[PDB]
Structure 1
Amino acid sequence: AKIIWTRTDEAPLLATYSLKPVVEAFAATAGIEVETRDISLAGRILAQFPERLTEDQKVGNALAELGELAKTPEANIIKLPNISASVPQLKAAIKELQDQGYDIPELPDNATTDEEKDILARYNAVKGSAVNPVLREGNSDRRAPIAVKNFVKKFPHRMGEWSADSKTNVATMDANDFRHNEKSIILDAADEVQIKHIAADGTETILKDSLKLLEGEVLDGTVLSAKALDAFLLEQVARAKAEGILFSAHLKATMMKVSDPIIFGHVVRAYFADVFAQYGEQLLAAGLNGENGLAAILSGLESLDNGEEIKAAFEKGLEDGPDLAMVNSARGITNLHVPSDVIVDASMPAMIRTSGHMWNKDDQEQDTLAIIPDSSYAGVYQTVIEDCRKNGAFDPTTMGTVPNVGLMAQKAEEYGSHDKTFRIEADGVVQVVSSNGDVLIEHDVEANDIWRACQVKDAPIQDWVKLAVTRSRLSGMPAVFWLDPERAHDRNLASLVEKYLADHDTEGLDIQILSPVEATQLSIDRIRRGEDTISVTGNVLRDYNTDLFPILELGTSAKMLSVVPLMAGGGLFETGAGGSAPKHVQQVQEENHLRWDSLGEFLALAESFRHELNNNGNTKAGVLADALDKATEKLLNEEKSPSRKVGEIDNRGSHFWLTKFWADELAAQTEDADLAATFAPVAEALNTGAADIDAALLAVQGGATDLGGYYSPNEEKLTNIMRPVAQFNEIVDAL
């Protein structure tokens, strides 16, 4: 078997030149090959334009080959953070490669010829998030890492004290929202369907011409009522004001790129009711509607020149309304200024952790009314708030843990809905119409309503159920499916979960189905008494739970095990969800200190070894994984993760100590005597040499360093820089 280690960009790229040769040496003792594949920005650019290159310059299409790999049981891929290119990064990479002799074309800035149109289309496929959709052929298994959990117990993060008198609450709609208006069906056979609007006129408008659906696919349609939404919002503005608490609003403007900016605008106009009552027609005509935040409105006013008295009215709105949760007090930035500033899955746990407070204009903590307009998920957070009010803050030294198994494959549910979401222009109805003419789903709609459809396919659902059973069996933790009886979609999924659970041996396992509110309550009841509960959920709750529980248990959601069990039986082990840390590279250029933390790599690696153990029968991989868990725990115990500061332990040093501790554990274990004899002299060499090797890895730091490039660094220079101590290299390369 083979483990593919992704060669990416910037900081993780540099770490990989140090860490991968060690991983390769240790892995080979379990009969496992470790190879890199090049999915760097520069490499993916070269892959896209082979026709311009000499044979020696060519890269082969590594992303496409990894995509194919992922559809086979052979796949075992360790994926590190990589660049999702902005246009500037793309232009910089292109220029760098041209300077190095690769005759690739310029990014056209105004394609007119057919060749230019083709080149632009090819580059546009390379920019942005190009990699994740090719590699994620699966659902999600995310867990707080045990090595990090055990350290938190030793050294807990701060948890704000809660008051029984707290007035913080979530406010959410009671009716006429996506949850209550949702209708859902399961297709009997494949069908290409149409989405249509029929106005009170009779005038038909096709909203989406063709939508191919599979046999067994689950289809939902639903509407958020603009009128109910507006009525609701105006009431919450008044409530925050009467109760003397912060008005706050929590959406996902970035991911839900069609619905949530619209909803946001409704929020802004509610807060500034009097302003829109007097200048509404004019502002809306000029596109100053709040869907790009209050800051866009304010900026646009200078073009209007009755804008001065409008500016004055907004300023008056801010003095007269409830106090707003602040994004940046020093710049005067409120919750309403930029739609993407406050993002629900981050903001809600941060507020819960901070005694249920957000920050006011004086930069002091204050209770908040947290507005989450649609009611599908609001109750999870409300249930946690009420529990903290009654029982006080969670105690990270004793609390249990709540992993997540999440239905994600093929852009499941709301995260595939953006091309099926429509701002309604006129009163009437919207129909999903079958090819045969049948009307499958129908909703009444009014102008300014939001209509949305969502799809999840049957194989992803079956895979999701298998993964829930597998996680419960392997971990011993009970599993709870979070499905809301009041949602049509969740009622359909519940019937399928019941059907498919019968394909599995569940004897000895505790698996049940509860509403999201019931499930949250059970989970937190268990967590407080030190016990564990796996949350089995759809796509959005995946996104929410994988922030909420880690932030409470660990102080952060940035340090997680994230696995995507691939459809054909392989695995993808994602080391990290952040970017590739350009400032980290700057520091190495300036003073040869790499502060990049490889913890996520050590953790994903241990799970990669477990995949070989569990799916491919590799007993030695299991031994390697057990030792690696203990080595990681020791590295954290001695705080040997990289310092930020020059002259102190860096990324290369952390790799050394991790390798020393992992070898020690392999030499000390008695589960595989042959592995023990292999690593006894390795451990002895690293121990005797540790004082000298550690001093040397400190000594290389301090001065300017030449990588030979940035997007396309020189391989000889990177090797010498990232593997600078011959004494260590000799031990690794001999094993």
Structure 2
Amino acid sequence: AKIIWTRTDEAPLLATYSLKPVVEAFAATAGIEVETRDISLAGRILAQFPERLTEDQKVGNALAELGELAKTPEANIIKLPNISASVPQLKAAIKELQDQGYDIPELPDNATTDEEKDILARYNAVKGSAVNPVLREGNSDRRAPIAVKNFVKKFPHRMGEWSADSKTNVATMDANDFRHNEKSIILDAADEVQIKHIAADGTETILKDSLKLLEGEVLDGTVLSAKALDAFLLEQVARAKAEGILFSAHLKATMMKVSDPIIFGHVVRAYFADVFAQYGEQLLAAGLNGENGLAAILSGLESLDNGEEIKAAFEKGLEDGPDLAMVNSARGITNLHVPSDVIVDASMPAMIRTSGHMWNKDDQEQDTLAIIPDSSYAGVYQTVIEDCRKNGAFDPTTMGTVPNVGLMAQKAEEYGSHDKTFRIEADGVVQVVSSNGDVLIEHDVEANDIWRACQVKDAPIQDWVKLAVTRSRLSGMPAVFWLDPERAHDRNLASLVEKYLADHDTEGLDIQILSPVEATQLSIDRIRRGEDTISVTGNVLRDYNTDLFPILELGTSAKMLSVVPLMAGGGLFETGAGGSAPKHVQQVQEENHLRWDSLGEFLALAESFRHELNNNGNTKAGVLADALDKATEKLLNEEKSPSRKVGEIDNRGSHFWLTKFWADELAAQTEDADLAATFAPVAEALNTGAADIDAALLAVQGGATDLGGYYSPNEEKLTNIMRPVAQFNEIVDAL
């Protein structure tokens, strides 16, 4: 079997030249090969223009090849952070590659010829998040790392004290929202449906022409009532003002790129009701409706004859209305300025951790009325708020853990509803018509309403249920499926879950189904008494829960174990969710100190070995994993992660110490005498030379360093820079 270690960009790329050689050496003792595959921005660019490269220049298509491997049982991929190219990065890499002799074309700013359109199309295939779509062939398994969990028990982050008088509460809709208006069905045969809009004029309008559906696929139809929404919003504005608490709105404008910016607009107009009551007609016509935030509005006023007048009306609105949660008080930026500034899954946990407070214009903590329009998930947060007001803040040193098994395969549910979300312009009805004419789903709609369709396939669902059983079985932690009895969609999934659980051996397992609210209560009841509960949820709750609990338990959701059980039985282990940190590379170029933290790679590697143990019966891989777990605990116990300052331990130094501790554990363990015998001399060697190696790894730091490039650094220079201590390299190479 072989593990594929992704060769990426910037910081993690540098770290890879130091860590991968060690991983390969250690993995080999369990009969595991470790190979790199190039998915760097530079490599993916070259992959698009093979016809422009000489035979020796061609790189093939590593990403495409990994996509294929991911569909086979042999897949064991460790995925490190990489660049999701912006136009500037793309342009910069193009130039560097050209300077290196790769005769690739310029990035067309505006395609004005057939050649440019073609070139642009190929470059667009490389821009942005091009990697994840290809590698994530499955559902999500995310857990708080126990090595991290154990550290936090020793050094707990700060949790804001909670008062039983807290006035903080989530405000959400009682009806007429996505949750209550949702209708869901399960196709019993493949079908190519269509979404129509029939007005009162009977005038039927086609919203979505062709939608291919598979047998067993779950399809939902729902609508958000603009009328009920505005009524709700105005009520909350008044309540926040009446109670003297901060008004805040928590949406996900970035991911839900269609529905949420629109809902954000309603929030803005609701807050500045008087302004739009006086200049509505004008403002909306000018496109200044708040869907781009208050900032977009204000800047657009300097384009109107009465801009200064309207601008004063807004300023009056801010002084008269309830105080707003602040994004940046120093710049007067409120919750309402930019739609994407406040993102629900990030903002709610922070507020809960901070005694249920957000910040006012005077940079002071204050209770808040947290508006979450749709009620599908608002109850989860509300349940935690009431619990904290009742029992106090959670205690990181004794609290249990709540992992997540999430349904996300093939843009499952809401995260794939973007091309099926429409802003209703006229009263009437929207219907999903079968290929034969039958009306599968139909909703009464009114101008300004938001109609949405979601879909999730059967295989993803069966795999999700299997993953839940697997995690409960392997961890011994009870699993709870979070399904809302009030949602047609969830009611459909509940029956499928009940059906598919029967395909598994669940004797001895504690598995059940509860509404998101009941599930949250049980989970936090147990967490407070130091017990654990796996949350098995849909896509959105997966996105919320993997932020919520890790932040409460660890103070951050940044250090997580992230696994994607691949379709064909293989595994994808993501080391981190951030970027490839360009500033870290800059520091290496400036003073040869890499502060990139490889903790995520250590964690993912241990799980990768366990994949081999549990799925390919590699017992030696489990021994390697157990020793690596202990080595990581010690690295953290001695605070040997990279320091941010030159002259102090950096990425290379952390690798050495992890390696030393790992060899020690392997030489000390008694499960495999052979492995013990193989590592005894390695540990011995690393130990006598530790003092010299550690000093040498501090000595190399200090001055300017030349990587021979940036997006396409020079192979020989990188190796020389990242593996500078011969004493260490020789111990590793000998293995």
Cα deviation code 1:430-471 (max 9, x no counterpart):
010001000000000000000000000000000000000000
Asked if 1:395 corresponds to 2:426, the answer is no
Task: Give the deviation of 1:192 after TM superposition.
Answer: 0.3
For residues 329 and 296 of structure 1, the distance between their equivalents in structure 2, rounded to whole angstroms, comes to 18
Cα deviation code 1:106-157 (max 9, x no counterpart):
1112223222211110000100000000000000000000000000000100
4+ residue segments displaced more than 3 Å: none
For residues 722 and 481 of structure 1, the distance between their equivalents in structure 2, rounded to whole angstroms, comes to 46
Q: 1:360 — aligned with what?
A: 360
Cα deviation code 1:525-584 (max 9, x no counterpart):
000000000000000000000000000000000000000000100000000000000000
Q: 1:186 — aligned with what?
A: 186
The SS at the match of 1:57 is: coil
For residues 575 and 392 of structure 1, the distance between their equivalents in structure 2, rounded to whole angstroms, comes to 33
The SS at the match of 1:579 is: coil
For residues 537 and 116 of structure 2, the distance between their equivalents in structure 1, rounded to whole angstroms, comes to 45
The SS at the match of 1:455 is: strand
Cα deviation code 1:349-391 (max 9, x no counterpart):
0000000000000000000000000000000000000000000
For residues 108 and 316 of structure 1, the distance between their equivalents in structure 2, rounded to whole angstroms, comes to 46
For residues 182 and 646 of structure 2, the distance between their equivalents in structure 1, rounded to whole angstroms, comes to 57
For residues 80 and 371 of structure 2, the distance between their equivalents in structure 1, rounded to whole angstroms, comes to 36
For residues 142 and 4 of structure 2, the distance between their equivalents in structure 1, rounded to whole angstroms, comes to 20
Structure 1 residues not aligned, in runs of 5+: none
Q: Which moved more, 1:74-83 or 1:110-119?
A: 110-119
For residues 406 and 94 of structure 2, the distance between their equivalents in structure 1, rounded to whole angstroms, comes to 38
Cα deviation code 1:590-616 (max 9, x no counterpart):
000000000000000000000000000
For residues 726 and 334 of structure 1, the distance between their equivalents in structure 2, rounded to whole angstroms, comes to 55
Cα deviation code 1:67-90 (max 9, x no counterpart):
000000000000000000001100
Task: Give the deviation of 1:187 after TM superposition.
Answer: 0.0
For residues 116 and 127 of structure 1, the distance between their equivalents in structure 2, rounded to whole angstroms, comes to 16
Q: Which moved more, 1:370-379 or 1:200-209?
A: 200-209
The SS at the match of 1:471 is: helix
Q: 1:204 — aligned with what?
A: 204
Cα deviation code 1:283-333 (max 9, x no counterpart):
000000000000000000000020111000000000000000000010100
Task: Give the deviation of 1:689 after TM superposition.
Answer: 0.2
State the identity as a percent: 100
The SS at the match of 2:275 is: helix
Q: 1:98 — aligned with what?
A: 98
The SS at the match of 1:505 is: coil
Number of positions where the alignment pairs a residue of Structure 1 with one of Structure 2: 735
Task: Give the deviation of 1:163 after TM superposition.
Answer: 0.1
Q: 2:699 — aligned with what?
A: 699
For residues 479 and 303 of structure 1, the distance between their equivalents in structure 2, rounded to whole angstroms, comes to 57
For residues 352 and 303 of structure 1, the distance between their equivalents in structure 2, rounded to whole angstroms, comes to 41
For residues 238 and 487 of structure 1, the distance between their equivalents in structure 2, rounded to whole angstroms, comes to 29
For residues 111 and 611 of structure 1, the distance between their equivalents in structure 2, rounded to whole angstroms, comes to 47
The SS at the match of 1:573 is: strand
The SS at the match of 2:691 is: helix
Q: 1:405 — aligned with what?
A: 405
Cα deviation code 1:21-56 (max 9, x no counterpart):
000000000000000000000000000100000011
Q: Which moved more, 1:248-257 or 1:195-204?
A: 195-204
For residues 68 and 199 of structure 1, the distance between their equivalents in structure 2, rounded to whole angstroms, comes to 47
The SS at the match of 2:370 is: strand
The SS at the match of 1:341 is: coil
The SS at the match of 2:164 is: coil
The SS at the match of 1:540 is: helix
Q: 2:659 — aligned with what?
A: 659
For residues 167 and 526 of structure 1, the distance between their equivalents in structure 2, rounded to whole angstroms, comes to 25
The SS at the match of 2:72 is: coil
Cα deviation code 1:489-528 (max 9, x no counterpart):
0000000000000000000000000000000000000000
Cα deviation code 1:168-201 (max 9, x no counterpart):
0000000000000000000010000000101111
For residues 185 and 107 of structure 1, the distance between their equivalents in structure 2, rounded to whole angstroms, comes to 45
Cα deviation code 1:384-419 (max 9, x no counterpart):
000000000000000000000000000000000000
What TM-score do you get using the length of structure 1 for normalisation? 1.00
For residues 20 and 403 of structure 1, the distance between their equivalents in structure 2, rounded to whole angstroms, comes to 29
What TM-score do you get using the length of structure 2 for normalisation? 1.00
| Aligned 1:318-717 pairs, distance under 5 A | 318-717=318-717
Task: Give the deviation of 1:341 after TM superposition.
Answer: 0.2
The SS at the match of 1:670 is: coil
For residues 309 and 682 of structure 1, the distance between their equivalents in structure 2, rounded to whole angstroms, comes to 77
The SS at the match of 1:126 is: coil
The SS at the match of 2:290 is: coil
For residues 380 and 105 of structure 1, the distance between their equivalents in structure 2, rounded to whole angstroms, comes to 51
For residues 553 and 302 of structure 2, the distance between their equivalents in structure 1, rounded to whole angstroms, comes to 48
Task: Give the deviation of 1:204 after TM superposition.
Answer: 1.3
For residues 109 and 669 of structure 2, the distance between their equivalents in structure 1, rounded to whole angstroms, comes to 61
For residues 298 and 589 of structure 1, the distance between their equivalents in structure 2, rounded to whole angstroms, comes to 42
For residues 678 and 146 of structure 1, the distance between their equivalents in structure 2, rounded to whole angstroms, comes to 28
For residues 307 and 225 of structure 1, the distance between their equivalents in structure 2, rounded to whole angstroms, comes to 32
For residues 356 and 108 of structure 2, the distance between their equivalents in structure 1, rounded to whole angstroms, comes to 50
The SS at the match of 1:707 is: coil
The SS at the match of 1:281 is: helix
For residues 391 and 223 of structure 1, the distance between their equivalents in structure 2, rounded to whole angstroms, comes to 37
Task: Give the deviation of 1:663 after TM superposition.
Answer: 0.1
Cα deviation code 1:210-265 (max 9, x no counterpart):
00000000000000000000000000000000000000000000000000000000
Task: Give the deviation of 1:205 after TM superposition.
Answer: 1.0
Task: Give the deviation of 1:203 after TM superposition.
Answer: 1.1
For residues 556 and 111 of structure 2, the distance between their equivalents in structure 1, rounded to whole angstroms, comes to 45
